[PDB]
Symmetry: C3
Subunit: 150 residues, 3 copies
């Protein structure tokens, strides 16, 4: 099975930046409703999608209590619980993060380590790459992810 997901958020000065589950030192952070972790959101949608289960807007509306104030690993692990209950064995996640600042290169090890631990995948099965928008989208973070299961 395959799943594909995307996420993006406005970034603003003096807000915390969360990506791949981690708080990243940055001059900008998401202007969100959530922690705005675009990588987790894209991955979560990709997982749900692989089983036709909907998306984070359907399954995690803030109006449900359990989701209000929650960090995005809660959404990811619930999607993992849902596909696992349907017999899924996650094999791989490959995703691209796009943002002009800050540079994610120095945080490569930490970001992969976190995704590896969250999705319970070996490091060679976490394919994370970083891009800038080349001035296409200087005020957003963007994420696009593909997952592979069984």
């Amino acid at each position: 099975r395959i799943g594909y997901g995307e996420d993006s958020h406005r970034l603003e000065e003096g807000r915390p930046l969360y990506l791949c589950g981690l708080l990243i030192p940055s001059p900008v952070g998401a202007l969100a409703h959530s922690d705005g972790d675009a990588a987790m959101h894209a991955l979560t949608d990709a997982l749900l999608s692989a089983y036709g289960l909907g998306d984070i807007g359907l399954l995690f509306p803030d109006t449900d209590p359990r989701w209000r104030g929650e960090r995005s690993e809660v959404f990811l692990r619930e999607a993992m619980r849902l596909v696992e209950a349907r017999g899924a064995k996650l094999l791989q996640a490959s995703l691209v993060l796009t943002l002009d600042r800050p540079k994610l290169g120095p945080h490569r090890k930490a970001l992969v380590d976190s995704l590896s631990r969250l999705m319970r995948l070996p490091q060679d099965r976490i394919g994370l790459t970083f891009k800038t928008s080349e001035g296409l989208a200087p005020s957003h973070v963007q994420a696009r992810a593909v997952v592979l299961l069984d």
Copy 2:
């Protein structure tokens, strides 16, 4: 086999909106010479791509009378005919629709039912997720799609 397809269209106020084969009540709709159904176009290109057959610009140009003015479902069924004749067995389609309005949430069932009916896939093999652009692309509808076959 895997295929990847994308489409985007300018949205204009007061034009009809077509997605996944359906008319969706909306304040905005594609400005296009086609019906502008980004979902159909992205899926069609992904199917073509999975066999290297080209893209919808090549196979369904507005110059070709058989295709001019037709709804986009006609091009998807033709792409399905072409890949089926080359032995394809479509397994899964996962795609993301991005647009700032209207909300697609209320239409989720009919949209997924449509894709399942047109592509002849069970609903758990239709992975449809909805996003807004968070202000990055407030005047366009975008779709990106992955298909898996065989």
Copy 3:
């Protein structure tokens, strides 16, 4: 295994345009430090991604004299070497190129032939499709690619 990658470049008047390893006659070309071949970059990142090896920013930085000034095909071939050494057999590449000008249609055969030769894949396993941005991004070339291996 699966890998996903993306690339974009600002386009500027009177610069040469390189795509899929070829010179493409054009009024606009990438402004950059590389040849700005978005197809090559996105394919290379997708390959690297399929094995968790990093991305082109990590492995091919212009601080490294081995890589500065090299054509992007040299990067793609090195990524091929690295995954092949880890047992991979590339099976398929499917990608989308997005740009408002020049038209890529007239170059389809040459572009696909180049990808086929470079990646040593049969033509039906090269899924290249072309799009314009519909004015979303009229001054960039964008590429997004999925690769499948084994």
